[PDB]
Design a protein around this ligand. Structure first.
Ligand SMILES: [Mg+2]
Ligand SMILES: [Mg+2]
Ligand SMILES: [Mg+2]
Ligand SMILES: [Mg+2]
Lengths: 415, 415, 415, 415
């Protein structure tokens, strides 16, 4: 082995909502250090990989001291002396040590931080950028971002049922010019809101949560801001419906109605005919398997249909989805699965079977921009990393602006 | 010269509000690299160091391509080959190259970034943390934070005159426990706001801007939340009144009145008698010199009186203030003055003359945590770096949690 | 730049058929050296990147002294001092230096060798295997080989119209066992041929060219050998028809008849219904656009349809093929396009649009196993590199056996 | 010891006929790596050093898993920590560890791999070409190749008795021009066979096996091709009769007859009177001692007489040959004897006693070109490494073309 893991440590830091999370730091035998901050995920649930939370008097039960302990003691003891450069061996060792199928022992907050930290340490020792370490010279594509600038659903307290209303800048030949257009549109939206007596205060991802009437008003507002900014036809709309949040008893409860699966599908067809929606995430619920099958038949050749809660970044669940023809794209949330290698597996599966991958943030983020490198490393072509404000979101865009001096490839509207 | 500056560059990145700002990167002759991002400043005004803005069609007038060109061409040409370790010579060269008394040639956004980036590159060459590079083995004190968790004034659209309502965790023997307290109190406040029908969406610094009635309602709310959290007597209140914003025709226009300077002082005496306010910033206007003299006589021995707009991190203006006995503390905003050395000169003058220094963020921040290390390097004992949310604020608290593993001295209530 | 290209040279070597070709060697500023040998291409044609041949009295007009001089003089002069690790800038520089759309100035045999040699040199400098240099930690899949063990058409002198009859070992969980199976099937074929009085002497790719009656006898013989070897149901059949070779006057002349495009497609339907054929390459001619659209409608959901002459590894021609729905896979011959970057672009375009990539050899190969690393770097999942004999074929299989000790993932029949 | 052997391993790869062989890899304590592939030999026999073969269900009984194990376990355990640069000590240790006179224990395929691999690793550590490591600055002579371009005997299934019909380019002042002459002659031979209805498919060493009528018809064809190519009198003919293959009950069964030793000798005399045959290998059988003595007396001062099966590269057998005046040259096959030092011992014996050495390939070769370096290292002046086709042959020619840029000395016709 060329270099080995010499030291590993973790400690408690704060995420962008002010809750604790794990930072890990790995030192190699040449003295190269890498570190990484894990975004916040879910500590209960039977599908997702689980993060460990302390549930004691500190920080409202949200301390991560046990996750931190598991890195400093259990993981440390198992990985010191492993080859720094064999990411797959490190990640498989983490899985085997945990011994469950959802990291319910070590905690995904313990395993991901160590997984990302080791990769960074390896890249540092080679003097190479992280995206080159993860994806080689083939790492090239700067992703088209989808930028959540108007919020509703559970992400707000309004009458808007849909969770995320996003703008996507396709009509550009460079990432920086694309980034500039969404920045300009966001500024215009802020003004439009202020001038009609709405709050300009921000939600967790940097977007606005004004109390609008329904699910089409926010779209109309995006359209008029896009046009006023001078980008008509070059910026399109993406939605995250998060339909599991309002699915009860076989029905979807929105817009004062109780919708059937088939009726909600017809609603999306309607919306897609009237507005330049290019993508819809979680249009149907995470267990509405029959509905998704229909959704994909009706719209899967016209628009992107992204599984988030449907697939939870999980290779096996995505495989069954691929087989049964559900969706045509998958949100990629690395902490949801627990190591960089398992994330890569899910992405490779999707890309071998015509599913697009959207590298994704979490609601509780950090200053760590790992997912900007990851999106380029795997040529995802898409990233979902927030509005154009709040440092835990702008850190990712800034990283992508850096990577752009070395590899400036942006697909925009090109195949 | 041991190592020399070998390369200097800059490029446009985004600050935490979605406006462009400068990131600079300096490479030394051993290959060590340092980078820094500059927070947003003022591009107009007659007192402060000015940042350069392009004022063209991009980003609503706020592009920084001229500043960036100033790093890439003008500064680079001048500093290539200078001793990496002579910060003072670097910063003095920048001042001379600029040739003005307010950086209105190079732009303070061009000079600060290079000043910061060179310091990080020198610390990296030595394998030393930034705070050790800046302040040596004498760097020791983890500062007490003042955290802006309720906003008013120009920072919101309410009936509240004062700008910032802050909590300061004095009653603790460690920084980690001090920070926990403010995080717990912030979470409690978030919940109180939500249950009382206020928005929990955030202002620029991560605080809330509810439409409250007056200037004491916000204080009462902080007090309730402090006690509910279990930290009664251990956490005090600081204010930024930003009184220049309501000073007109010799009078202060607040609480539906027109106060003379004398009347406003006795109002502060009242407030300080009723509540545990330990610090008031810009209690009087930036040009109300007579008022400041009287205020300082009246409360200067009981509470901290911070000059922000009064001093603008400027050594000369501070010197006159000391001589005239105005204030007993100074807010330190490095980008206001334009280099690290000029910042250190202002701090040293203050500390030689019994004025406390509060190391400060700006409204437009980034993921760069320089001011955390800077606060420790200079033993300021206090920092003002935002609420306990938004990554551009939590990055500083996190950096302070890392520094604490090497130097854990927290003064708290100790002399 | 960490390391820069310090030296570039070339010289004439011999390919696996005894003709000259270009060997290039690149030295970096730390002393690291990479070398590569270019497979032989086409010095005429209207679509392909051209290789320069001397056309003098040496080597029957096939000298490459002008290609060699282009590396030693023109390319060298231009790329000395360029950043070793920026493959894309290297390859874009080679393209621009050339100035044409098909390397008809420098020659693709001049540019590919330097392109590959720089990549090997950068990988050696980092102590990294080439596949990790090219595809990072994400480089993982060992490809399923398609092995050309019976020949016909222009690659023989017989009644067989089709050019290549190949076996593909799908039914295995490891590459080594898959490879053993095809070696075992190959040895059995050899014995069967010898016992029937056929020659066991080899064509250019290591396969046999017995004088068989038609296009189905070779397939019947492959099935018999698959079964005797013990691998029934685990090894499938792939074909390269190379139909352009018998396309004349809008018809295909084979099996003693003149087929319409439509009639030839129906022959493939019949063949596929009777035999386990998983892939057909150049089933229709390189210019039979309407036929390919029909073929792809008819069989593209059931079998792999590989464009070789159709696409000539060219991203622009492939892109039109995607838009026009022709084929669902593409043969990747790096020397056909001229740089490793242009190769990666064609592969990325393919993989974004649901086309499979088959990393391929040429008839004139060398001991250079670059395409083995390249297949793994880009997770192509498939490779065509010859029969299981002749060192210029076995060098690639051996390289894949070496890569297998570091990443052993073999998909086989898995999605 | 400047460096020591730090790691030793082996694994199965494929030879050029598609059978397993051993690849060995040796790493030194500076991290320098050397690797080597063993050509195929004999698992049985009472004269040659033996290669170990598995004899189980894998690869028709040709697996080398036991050889591989002997490298990874027995050898490794014995040589780890030995001086990297003491080639003689390493090779003697291998011989001692084996404890037989014919490597029947470890297997010659286990020991030669390690022997070559260590030499390459030492050369790499010194930054020197292998031929310099083995032969120093005195290593100079590029060998005259004998190129087997028409096959008979056991190497085909024709009515041709002799095994190899070779061309040798003496009439040139550079190796490259000699190599070009043989490439051009081979191309002309290919055309001649294709126009007279013969197969152009290749045998194991890259030559053709047309069904000719006797042993002079092939020579006639070589002469025609030499003259048509324009190289008359500059290229000569060398034969390998491999007469042991047809020797039985005292006599030599060829051309429908049983020849006495003396009659076969008179046949060589006739053949050498009529054609420019400069060398004959194994003209008489391996145990026909009285015959060899007469053949040597008769033609030994006129033509080269090479022992292959007569001497099996074995020092002791050659020594007795020298004493009894049998042959005037020895074929040198390193895997036949089992280490580089032992190979060297045999060559030095020969060169001290006026025996010419022909560095030789095996019919199961690999991409490894060790024997090209070895020929130059020892100034053999002659090499037999196949036809001008197939990668496992052209790899050697190419390596000699590389060495020619550093040492261009070619004797050709000079003493
Ligand atoms: Mg979602
Ligand atoms: Mg202030
Ligand atoms: Mg083809
Ligand atoms: Mg022989």
């Amino acid at each position: 082995a060329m270099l080995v893991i010499e030291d590993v440590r973790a400690y408690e830091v704060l995420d962008s909502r002010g809750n604790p999370t794990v930072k890990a730091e790995v030192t190699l035998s040449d003295g190269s250090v890498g570190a990484a901050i894990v975004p916040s995920g879910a500590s209960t649930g039977s599908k997702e990989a689980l993060e460990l939370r302390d549930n004691d008097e500190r920080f409202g039960g949200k301390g991560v001291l046990k996750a931190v302990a598991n890195v400093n003691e259990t993981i440390a003891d198992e990985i010191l002396g492993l080859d720094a450069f064999n990411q797959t061996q490190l990640d498989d060792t983490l899985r085997e040590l945990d011994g469950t199928n959802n990291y319910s022992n070590l905690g995904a907050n313990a395993t991901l931080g160590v997984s990302m930290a080791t990769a960074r340490a390896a890249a540092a020792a080679l003097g190479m950028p992280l995206y080159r370490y993860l994806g080689g010279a083939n790492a090239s594509i700067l992703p088209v971002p989808m930028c959540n600038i108007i919020n509703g659903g559970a992400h707000a307290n309004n009458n808007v049922d849909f969770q995320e209303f996003m703008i996507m800048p396709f009509g550009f030949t460079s990432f920086k010019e694309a980034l500039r257009s969404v920045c300009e549109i966001y500024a215009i939206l802020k003004k439009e809101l202020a001038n009609s007596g709405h709050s300009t205060a921000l939600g967790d991802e940097g977007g606005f949560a004004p109390n609008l009437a329904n699910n089409t008003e926010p779209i109309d507002l995006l359209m008029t801001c896009i046009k006023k900014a001078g980008y008509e036809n070059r910026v399109k709309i993406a939605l995250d419906v998060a339909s599991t949040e309002f699915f009860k008893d076989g029905k979807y409860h929105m817009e004062g109605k109780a919708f059937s699966s088939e009726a909600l599908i017809e609603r999306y067809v309607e919306l897609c005919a009237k507005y330049p929606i290019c993508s819809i995430e979680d249009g149907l619920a995470e267990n509405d398997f029959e509905g998704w099958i229909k959704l994909t038949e009706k719209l899967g050749n016209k628009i992107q249909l992204v599984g988030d809660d449907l697939f939870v970044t999980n290779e096996d669940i995505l495989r069954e989805g691929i087989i049964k023809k559900m969706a045509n794209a998958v949100l990629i949330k690395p902490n949801q699965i627990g190591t960089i290698t398992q994330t890569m597996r899910t992405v490779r599966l999707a890309q071998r079977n015509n599913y697009k991958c959207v590298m994704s943030h979490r609601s509780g983020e950090s200053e760590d921009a790992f997912i900007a490198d990851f999106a380029v490393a795997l040529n995802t072509g898409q990233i979902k990393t927030g509005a154009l404000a709040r440092g835990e979101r702008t850190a990712k865009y800034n990283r992508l602006l850096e990577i752009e001096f070395e590899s400036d490839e942006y697909l925009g509207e090109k195949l």
